[PDB]
């Protein structure tokens, strides 16, 4: 006879990110604070956050 073949519920997923991080925290924690008149902008693309 066939026994108890109950399948578990947990799942493990590990994969290479293949893309570098955006490093938004490194830019938001800069030692230099731009003035409200300058408001230097930043563009982030092709990165993970």
């Amino acid at each position: 006879l066939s026994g108890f073949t109950v399948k578990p519920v947990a799942t493990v997923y590990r994969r290479i990110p293949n893309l570098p991080d955006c490093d938004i925290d490194n830019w938001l924690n800069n030692v230099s604070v731009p003035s409200p008149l300058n408001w230097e902008r930043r563009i982030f693309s092709n990165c993970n956050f």
Partner: protein
């Protein structure tokens, strides 16, 4: 929205800890299956492996 390449990371791959000892499903590194995890100390792996 729902396009481009800058996707998120906390959607479903929360990087769960290795629950060694019990049977769990493997869906990591593009390989599907099931198995039990153990803990060893290997040294034959390389940077590209």
């Amino acid at each position: 929205i729902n396009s481009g390449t800058t996707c998120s990371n906390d959607l479903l791959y929360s990087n769960t800890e290795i629950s060694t000892g019990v049977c769990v499903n493997y869906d990591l590194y593009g390989i599907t299956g099931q198995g039990i995890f153990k803990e060893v100390s290997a040294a034959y792996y390389n940077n590209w492996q």
